[PDB]
Amino acid sequence: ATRTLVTASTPGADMTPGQLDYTSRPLDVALQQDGWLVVQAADGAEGYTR
Amino acid sequence: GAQSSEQTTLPSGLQIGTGVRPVATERLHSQGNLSQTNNSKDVAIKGQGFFQ
Amino acid sequence: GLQIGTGVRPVATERLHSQGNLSQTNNSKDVAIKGQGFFQ
Amino acid sequence: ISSLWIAKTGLDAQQTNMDVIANNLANVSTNGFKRQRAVFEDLLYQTIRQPGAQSSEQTTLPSGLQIGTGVRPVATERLHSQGNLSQTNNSKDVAIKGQGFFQVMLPDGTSAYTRDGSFQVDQNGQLVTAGGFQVQPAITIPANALSITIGRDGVVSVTQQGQAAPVQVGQLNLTTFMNDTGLESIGENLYIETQSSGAPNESTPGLNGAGLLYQGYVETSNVNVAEELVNMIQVQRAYEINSKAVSTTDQMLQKLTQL
Amino acid sequence: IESQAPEKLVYEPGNPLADANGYVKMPNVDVVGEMVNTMSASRSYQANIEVLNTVKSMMLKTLTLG
């Protein structure tokens, strides 16, 4: 068994929080290290975002 | 697939992005400063409102 | 572990409600309050 | 390639160091800030050939190959030094001389410790910090208070219209840790305890190695711009050197694959 | 057979394959060695093909002795 094909693959993601800037807008929010805002997706099932 | 956590591995899914699009352009309706022109027919609005 | 910063922002603005100096005006209707309190 | 996989770590380390320097410069005018310094550490080394001894009196070089692996940031230690004192003349400001932090109760029940002395009275009279977080001993202040004074050992007393004598309204103790460096820092200038530091101990100011309290002053940040600039310059130069290394290895790899 | 040379390992605690120290192991392949192996294998392949061709021609020519 010599031939060994290679296929690309992507793990889930990287959860390092990004840099945040202060725009002083009254209702702009930034989460904690592992925070997630819940929204209602188009299909109806809830989803998480930042 | 289904790893079942039998051994420490990583998922093998493959998803390809498509790009970025401009979704919106929003104006920050804050309160600006007041400049004094000493004119007799200039009006500055304090708060929220618009002339017609 | 280690922690990385992100910046600084204003949080509040406080007024110093101390006692101000008085200056004479000779006007019988000017009233300066001494101590605590506000006119309604 | 090992060259790329090492220079990537080098550039990441320089980027994190630059971020730390930028944060230190950014929060310079804030009250009660202790500067940070990030320390790096080299990874393990792999030996490909053992250093075979000769001992033949030939004065030969040791023939042993040992490739490096890279560098990682191991910790970012903060310097808990006593900063300068700036006067705000506000009667409800406390500056700590020595070591120790006030205890502040977070909304979720837990307690966080802070050194920033800037207190405002809430609607109910409890002494709270700017941001709504209140002090755990819960000092109360009555209405129609002529003047508020805070002692040198954390005794807070107020004077009424009469009685010709001040009446005490509470006590302001503070907590100390065995290793204040090992504290995890969250926003609103809050420090919380981890396993690195010991269990906090509470004491009145002036006892058990707890600093005194001065009224009307706040503690400025202990940031040294004269050294921050030098660190920035060195960071930039190291970043450029690593970029040159990446360019060189890319050029030689391209020459390899040309044929 | 797989080589017994030590394998390169990099510091990436994020990947689940990392061990207790965060060192994830990657293959150790000498790209120059592989390129030279490819070239030498191709040259030997061509040489053997040519040798076979010459021997076949000689056999076919000696098949009609006389």
Curated annotation (Swiss-Prot), chain A:
Q: What is this protein called?
A: Flagellar basal-body rod protein FlgF
The species this protein was found in: Salmonella typhimurium (strain LT2 / SGSC1412 / ATCC 700720)
Highest taxon of the lineage: Bacteria
Q: Where in the cell is it found?
A: Bacterial flagellum basal body
* Family assignment from sequence similarity: Belongs to the flagella basal body rod proteins family.
Description of how the protein assembles with itself and partners: The basal body constitutes a major portion of the flagellar organelle and consists of five rings (E,L,P,S, and M) mounted on a central rod. The rod consists of about 26 subunits of FlgG in the distal portion, and FlgB, FlgC and FlgF are thought to build up the proximal portion of the rod with about 6 subunits each.
From Swiss-Prot, chain D:
SUPFAM superfamilies recorded for this chain? Flagellar hook protein flgE
Q: Where in the cell is it found?
A: Bacterial flagellum basal body
Q: Name one Pfam family in it.
A: LlgE_F_G_D1
Q: Which UniProt keywords apply?
A: Bacterial flagellum
The cross-references to PROSITE patterns, in alphabetical order and at most eight, read: FLAGELLA_BB_ROD
InterPro entries recorded:
Flag_bb_rod_N, Flagellar_basal_body_rod_CS, Flagellar_FlgE/F/G, Flg_bb/hook_C_dom, FlgE/F/G-like, FlgG_G_neg, LlgE_F_G-like_D1
A GO biological process this protein is involved in? bacterial-type flagellum-dependent swarming motility
Q: GO CC terms on record? A: bacterial-type flagellum; bacterial-type flagellum basal body, distal rod
Self-association state and partner proteins as the record states: The basal body constitutes a major portion of the flagellar organelle and consists of four rings (L,P,S, and M) mounted on a central rod. The rod consists of about 26 subunits of FlgG in the distal portion, and FlgB, FlgC and FlgF are thought to build up the proximal portion of the rod with about 6 subunits each.
Family label: Belongs to the flagella basal body rod proteins family.
Designated name of the protein: Flagellar basal-body rod protein FlgG
Organism taxonomic ancestry? Bacteria, Pseudomonadati, Pseudomonadota, Gammaproteobacteria, Enterobacterales
Q: Which gene encodes it?
A: flgG
Swiss-Prot record, chain E:
Where in or outside the cell is it found? Answer: Bacterial flagellum basal body
What's the superkingdom here? Bacteria
Instruction: Please describe the quaternary structure of this protein.
Output: The basal body constitutes a major portion of the flagellar organelle and consists of four rings (L,P,S, and M) mounted on a central rod. The rod consists of about 26 subunits of FlgG in the distal portion, and FlgB, FlgC and FlgF are thought to build up the proximal portion of the rod with about 6 subunits each.
The UniProt entry's sequence similarity note says: Belongs to the flagella basal body rod proteins family.
Q: What is this protein called?
A: Flagellar basal-body rod protein FlgC
Query: Species name for this entry?
Result: Salmonella typhimurium (strain LT2 / SGSC1412 / ATCC 700720)
